[PDB]
Ligand binder design. Structure first.
Ligand code: EES
Ligand code: EES
Lengths: 236, 11, 242, 9
């Protein structure tokens, strides 16, 4: 295998190169929001990001070594986690706002337009605030997102041992970045821990949002693409 | 049998 | 905060002394299971374990420094994670079974007696298998259970809220120092130390997931009038719907 | 709230 022989510097480069583009939303900003429109914007966006997430996943070292069925399971398990950590990252330098896209920057109070949404916004905003107080770096972000891809579904499965080897390499890469940034050993271990404990909160937010998305589908507040229904269906 | 994800992956 | 001045060895020892007892279920072995009786056993057990968890949390360094309202939120957020990690710890030495209690050891085929349960059993069993593969040690288990308590609800008013958060993060950083200390003492290399720290903390993402799922499932049993929940449990459960 | 009381003991 070829992902097990990458260097720390080369793991970063490969992740930085695999990054998806930042997509714009269709939103016409001359008109205000309804509950149906906002939700349509969110799901339309997510549906387009999902296509590029598949391309990005295939470029994550070691992912391409897994069976097609295993790749499917991992992406089904983690897809909304991946979208949310994306969201939280780009919202990092906009305190109080979620940057869904460059032309869709939503205040905390705009989550009230959709029933049950503001609770989700609040958790997203507190995670972004956390990123900001840690001063999360781009190189660290691409490592965390990759970890989510490989970790979240790994226990719901040789296939497992390869993933855990690739995960160890990514741990090595995170530590390498912190050792390069001048952190002491004790500070490296502490930061590594702090960063990974955020993945617990991101899991919580995905689980909550999967439920909200389900409710919005049942109540029929908005039509969902076939791809999105399928990713939603995998969790139930 | 024909999940969209499946066919998006094997491209 | 005297807890911030604890060595690693004093942290371990305090956490080990704080451990709750292993409780018995009220399982009558000469009656047939139903969906209702099995859920009854699990919630009766959960309810009695909660009282011992409240007193364990008080013994976790730094926890008593927090305000009463923050202690409430932390436990309300994390109660089922904590119960579940206990259960997966207890089930380490019993492949294919969940030792809810010494008199309540269930396999996945018994989980099927309650609708929707077998999925959750399967996640719990696979986590126990991960624990066994890793050869998770009790000292590491008590550190993880404490991290769940402090971290899970930590992100849910200037100085006031901020310095409660700072304090929690200082305690969390001490538990990290303690885990590394343990692995170093056990003779793991510098690289193995950070790799294992990572592998252990990624399990908390899986435990969070299982708690989210179990809270949904419990809510559903409640809403179908399958089992009467004690007022404590009703309050704990209702914390997640508001 | 029960939890609140139990924590005071
Ligand atoms: O990049 C994105 C695109 C979409 C979403 N997102 N977050 C949601 C939370 C609840 C919900 O019902 C739908 C959501 C979407 Cl879409 C999150 C990040
Ligand atoms: O020590 C315990 C005591 C109870 C439980 N538990 N796990 C559950 C999963 C679903 C559910 O509806 C109730 C559950 C309980 Cl109680 C888990 C560990």
């Amino acid at each position: 295998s070829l992902a097990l022989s990458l260097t720390a510097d080369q793991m970063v480069s490969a992740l930085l190169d695999a990054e998806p583009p930042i997509l714009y939303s269709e939103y016409d900003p001359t008109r205000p929001f309804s509950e149906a429109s906002m939700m349509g914007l969110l799901t339309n966006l997510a549906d387009r990001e999902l296509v590029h997430m598949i391309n990005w996943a295939k470029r994550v070292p070691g992912f391409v070594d897994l069976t097609l069925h295993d790749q499917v399971h991992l992406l089904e398990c983690a897809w909304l986690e991946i979208l949310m950590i994306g969201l939280v990252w780009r919202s990092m330098e906009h305190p109080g706002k979620l940057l869904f896209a460059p032309n869709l920057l939503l205040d905390r109070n705009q989550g009230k337009c959709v029933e049950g949404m503001v609770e989700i916004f609040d958790m997203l905003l507190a995670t972004s605030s956390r990123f900001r107080m840690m001063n999360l770096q781009g190189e660290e972000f691409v490592c965390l997102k990759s970890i989510i891809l490989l970790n979240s579904g790994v226990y719901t499965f040789e296939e497992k041992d390869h993933i855990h080897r690739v995960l160890d390499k990514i741990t090595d890469t995170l530590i390498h970045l912190m050792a390069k940034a001048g952190l002491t050993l004790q500070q490296q271990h502490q930061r590594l821990a702090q960063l990974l404990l955020i993945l617990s909160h991101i899991r919580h937010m995905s689980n909550k949002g999967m439920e909200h998305l389900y409710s919005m589908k049942c109540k029929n507040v908005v039509p969902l693409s076939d791809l999105l229904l399928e990713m939603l269906d995998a969790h139930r | 049998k024909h999940k969209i994800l499946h066919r998006l992956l094997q491209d």
